[PDB]
Enzyme design. Structure first.
Site, PDB file in Angstrom:
ATOM      1  N   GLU A  35       0.829  -1.194   0.000  1.00 55.46           N
ATOM      2  CA  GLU A  35       0.000   0.000   0.000  1.00 55.46           C
ATOM      3  C   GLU A  35       0.863   1.244   0.000  1.00 55.46           C
ATOM      4  O   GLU A  35       0.565   2.215  -0.692  1.00 55.46           O
ATOM      5  CB  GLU A  35      -0.909   0.030   1.217  1.00 55.46           C
ATOM      6  CG  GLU A  35      -2.014  -1.004   1.128  1.00 55.46           C
ATOM      7  CD  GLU A  35      -3.030  -0.712   0.030  1.00 55.46           C
ATOM      8  OE1 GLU A  35      -3.033   0.411  -0.537  1.00 55.46           O
ATOM      9  OE2 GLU A  35      -3.823  -1.625  -0.280  1.00 55.46           O
ATOM     10  N   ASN A  46      -7.713   9.211  -5.267  1.00 55.15           N
ATOM     11  CA  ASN A  46      -8.519   8.284  -6.039  1.00 55.15           C
ATOM     12  C   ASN A  46      -9.345   9.010  -7.091  1.00 55.15           C
ATOM     13  O   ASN A  46      -9.555  10.219  -7.029  1.00 55.15           O
ATOM     14  CB  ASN A  46      -9.469   7.512  -5.131  1.00 55.15           C
ATOM     15  CG  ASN A  46      -8.750   6.766  -4.046  1.00 55.15           C
ATOM     16  OD1 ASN A  46      -9.097   6.856  -2.863  1.00 55.15           O
ATOM     17  ND2 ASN A  46      -7.734   6.043  -4.434  1.00 55.15           N
ATOM     18  N   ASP A  48     -12.536   9.116  -7.560  1.00 52.40           N
ATOM     19  CA  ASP A  48     -13.725   9.813  -7.086  1.00 52.40           C
ATOM     20  C   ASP A  48     -13.397  11.048  -6.262  1.00 52.40           C
ATOM     21  O   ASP A  48     -14.310  11.679  -5.725  1.00 52.40           O
ATOM     22  CB  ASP A  48     -14.604   8.872  -6.263  1.00 52.40           C
ATOM     23  CG  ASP A  48     -13.872   8.306  -5.054  1.00 52.40           C
ATOM     24  OD1 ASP A  48     -12.795   8.835  -4.718  1.00 52.40           O
ATOM     25  OD2 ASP A  48     -14.356   7.323  -4.454  1.00 52.40           O
ATOM     26  N   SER A  50     -11.625  11.081  -3.471  1.00 52.73           N
ATOM     27  CA  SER A  50     -11.166  10.668  -2.161  1.00 52.73           C
ATOM     28  C   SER A  50      -9.661  10.468  -2.208  1.00 52.73           C
ATOM     29  O   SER A  50      -9.046  10.453  -3.274  1.00 52.73           O
ATOM     30  CB  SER A  50     -11.884   9.390  -1.725  1.00 52.73           C
ATOM     31  OG  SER A  50     -11.546   8.307  -2.566  1.00 52.73           O
ATOM     32  N   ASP A  52      -6.318   8.356  -0.231  1.00 49.10           N
ATOM     33  CA  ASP A  52      -5.868   7.324   0.683  1.00 49.10           C
ATOM     34  C   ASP A  52      -4.670   7.836   1.469  1.00 49.10           C
ATOM     35  O   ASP A  52      -3.769   8.475   0.912  1.00 49.10           O
ATOM     36  CB  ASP A  52      -5.435   6.046  -0.034  1.00 49.10           C
ATOM     37  CG  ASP A  52      -6.573   5.339  -0.752  1.00 49.10           C
ATOM     38  OD1 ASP A  52      -7.757   5.605  -0.478  1.00 49.10           O
ATOM     39  OD2 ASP A  52      -6.266   4.471  -1.591  1.00 49.10           O
ATOM     40  N   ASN A  59      -8.883   5.239   3.278  1.00 56.92           N
ATOM     41  CA  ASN A  59      -9.571   6.091   2.326  1.00 56.92           C
ATOM     42  C   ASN A  59     -10.520   7.070   3.011  1.00 56.92           C
ATOM     43  O   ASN A  59     -11.267   6.703   3.915  1.00 56.92           O
ATOM     44  CB  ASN A  59     -10.341   5.216   1.342  1.00 56.92           C
ATOM     45  CG  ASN A  59     -11.115   6.026   0.351  1.00 56.92           C
ATOM     46  OD1 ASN A  59     -12.336   6.065   0.390  1.00 56.92           O
ATOM     47  ND2 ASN A  59     -10.415   6.711  -0.512  1.00 56.92           N
ATOM     48  N   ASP A 101     -15.377  -4.905   9.408  1.00 53.71           N
ATOM     49  CA  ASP A 101     -16.644  -4.438   8.865  1.00 53.71           C
ATOM     50  C   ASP A 101     -17.291  -5.429   7.906  1.00 53.71           C
ATOM     51  O   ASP A 101     -18.274  -5.070   7.243  1.00 53.71           O
ATOM     52  CB  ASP A 101     -16.456  -3.085   8.186  1.00 53.71           C
ATOM     53  CG  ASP A 101     -15.792  -3.189   6.839  1.00 53.71           C
ATOM     54  OD1 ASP A 101     -15.648  -4.313   6.302  1.00 53.71           O
ATOM     55  OD2 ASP A 101     -15.404  -2.128   6.308  1.00 53.71           O
TER      56      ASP A 101
END
Ligand SMILES: [Cl-]
Ligand SMILES: [Cl-]
Ligand code: NA
Length: 129
Positions: A35, A46, A48, A50, A52, A59, A101
């Site tokens: 990562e 990203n 969209d 967003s 990270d 994110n 999650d």
């Protein structure tokens, strides 16, 4: 801070990630390598809009607040900048929420594509833990 591999493994173990939700420490080290190349200051934007953040590339669309991802959630209730600290505590605690999650470590694309199904124990081999 750019972590050494064993240095990061020891830090993650101290913060309770080893076998957290059944993921052995090697998985977490492997995820951090791909990562962020172990760099707590890593950021990546990203599509969209967003971003990270940090050693685990958490994110902003869901997990932290960076003030520039409109309509995003802040489920770790932290500023995203907190994820860039030399102290990985905030990243770890947030990662614990993400991995819990329902989707496990598949939340991390690099883990899915480059760690899952590999000999992840190799990432902690030789480390004094
Ligand atoms: Cl392991
Ligand atoms: Cl799982
Ligand atoms: Na957010």
């Amino acid at each position: 801070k750019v972590f050494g591999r064993c240095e990061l493994a020891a830090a993650m173990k101290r913060h309770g990630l080893d076998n957290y939700r059944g993921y052995s420490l090697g998985n977490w080290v492997c995820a951090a390598k791909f990562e962020s190349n172990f760099n707590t200051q890593a950021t990546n934007r990203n599509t969209d809009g967003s971003t990270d953040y940090g050693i685990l590339q958490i994110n902003s669309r869901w997990w932290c607040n960076d003030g520039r991802t409109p309509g995003s959630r802040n489920l770790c209730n932290i500023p995203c900048s907190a994820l860039l600290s030399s102290d990985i505590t905030a990243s770890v605690n947030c990662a614990k929420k993400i991995v819990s999650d329902g989707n496990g470590m598949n939340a991390w694309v690099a883990w899915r594509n480059r760690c899952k199904g590999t000999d992840v124990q190799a990432w902690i081999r030789g480390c004094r833990l």
